Amino acid sequence: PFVNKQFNYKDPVNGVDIAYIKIPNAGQMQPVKAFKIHNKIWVIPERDTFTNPEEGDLNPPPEAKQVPVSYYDSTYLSTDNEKDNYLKGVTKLFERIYSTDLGRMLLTSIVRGIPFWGGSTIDTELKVIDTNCINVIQPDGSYRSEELNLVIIGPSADIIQFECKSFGHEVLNLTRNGYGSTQYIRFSPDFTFGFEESLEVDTNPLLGAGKFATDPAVTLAHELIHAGHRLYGIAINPNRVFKVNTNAYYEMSGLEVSFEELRTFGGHDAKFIDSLQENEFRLYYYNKFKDIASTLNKAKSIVGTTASLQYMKNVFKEKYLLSEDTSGKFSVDKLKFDKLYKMLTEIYTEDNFVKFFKVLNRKTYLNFDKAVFKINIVPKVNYTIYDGFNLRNTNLAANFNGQNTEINNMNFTKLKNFTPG
Ligand SMILES: [Zn+2]
Numbered sequence: 001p002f003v004n005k006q007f008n009y010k011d012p013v014n015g016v017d018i019a020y021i022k023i024p025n026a027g028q029m030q031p032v033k034a035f036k037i038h039n040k041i042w043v044i045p046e047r048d049t050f051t052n053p054e055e056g057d058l059n060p061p062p063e064a065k066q067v068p069v070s071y072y073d074s075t076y077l078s079t080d081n082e083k084d085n086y087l088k089g090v091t092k093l094f095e096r097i098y099s100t101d102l103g104r105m106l107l108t109s110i111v112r113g114i115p116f117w118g119g120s121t122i123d124t125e126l127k128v129i130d131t132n133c134i135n136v137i138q139p140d141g142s143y144r145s146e147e148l149n150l151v152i153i154g155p156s157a158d159i160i161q162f163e164c165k166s167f168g169h170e171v172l173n174l175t176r177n178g179y180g181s182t183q184y185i186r187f188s189p190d191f192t193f194g195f196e197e198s199l200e201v202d203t204n205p206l207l208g209a210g211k212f213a214t215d216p217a218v219t220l221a222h223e224l225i226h227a228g229h230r231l232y233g234i235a236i237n238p239n240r241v242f243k244v245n246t247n248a249y250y251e252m253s254g255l256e257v258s259f260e261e262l263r264t265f266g267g268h269d270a271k272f273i274d275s276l277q278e279n280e281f282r283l284y285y286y287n288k289f290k291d292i293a294s295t296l297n298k299a300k301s302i303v304g305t306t307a308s309l310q311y312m313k314n315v316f317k318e319k320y321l322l323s324e325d326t327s328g329k330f331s332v333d334k335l336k337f338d339k340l341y342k343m344l345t346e347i348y349t350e351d352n353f354v355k356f357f358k359v360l361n362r363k364t365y366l367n368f369d370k371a372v373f374k375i376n377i378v379p380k381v382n383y384t385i386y387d388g389f390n391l392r393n394t395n396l397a398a399n400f401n402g403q404n405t406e407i408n409n410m411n412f413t414k415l416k417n418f419t420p421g
Helices: 080-098 101-112 214-229 259-265 274-298 309-320 334-347 350-357
Strands: 020-021 032-037 040-048 135-139 145-149 151-155 163-165 185-186 191-197 209-212 240-241 256-258 371-374 414-418
Touching: 032 080, 040 080, 080 101, 080 214, 101 214, 101 334, 101 350, 151 214, 163 214, 191 214, 214 259, 214 334, 214 350, 240 259, 256 259, 259 350, 259 371, 274 309, 274 334
Parallel strands: 040 151, 151 185
Antiparallel strands: 020 032, 020 135, 032 040, 135 145, 163 185, 191 209, 191 371, 240 256, 371 414
């Protein structure tokens, strides 16, 4: 959410909000300087060569296997000045998101979505799952395990491959069982995508569609929406995908889109999901919350020297919005679950964010992207928390000129056009 201080990459560690940390990975990782921009949320201004074991180097894949919608550059995020710019770019986008009521609500839901403490083989024992924490070097030197819900990290080899990923436990699908898990978002504020849009205002089209760029804040929000689903364990299985096409004869016609993506994008598209299908998951996740409520009712002990069992029971009461009687027994409110579920899945959508931001965006998640641009969101004369690229009191503030790559060409440097396909 809102970032109290204006972090500088050079600022010395203080253990408090600036520290050296290590991610729970099966690889020999060295500590990296990280920043806690808000309770439960950290930013690691580094290329991500830590999360995925088979992605420890920024080496691009064979030219052939290289998808048209991709881009490589090993120099990106290699210098302190770049890391500083990255840090400030991410912070600024969080403020832009938080500056809206919708963004404020999502960030609050994210902060309260602490992954559930279901890491024990003993059902009556609450225990934290190790992959939902980071190891932080304390001021004195030693490492200490700390919980967090979200980490924003730079991309790995493919600079424009943004995503929301996390570590799995064992036989538990943490992102789909109501438990949730710490989310790692590969993202960059230094690049954005191009898309065509026809703002025609007459009968017939003449000048044609203009070339516009996606507002980075929309992209981050999209990613935070995925994080919101995942932290609450209500993400839709990725094997649930929809088929779309104009003359789709039969048996896989036209690229496919997952239910998760569609739901996240929202808009008229999201309506491509029957109320039955939408009600089946609602029920499915309603039962998972009930199992969580039942686990907390039978809990008798807790592991760790951090929090007390009552504290964590309260923490999860606030997260799942559980009902509590006089004896202190928890239960899931059928109606309250409907509210929280609708919020996380129908209110927090890319479409609604586009509306609150008042910017131009692709009309469909399916709407292909033309090319990729280099941008600089840090300078106030290029982009602001409230207007984005469409600076008020300027010509950029008209007809989404600020996002027009031709008009505001000085704020967009093209790198590569997706020609192959
Ligand atoms: Zn997505």
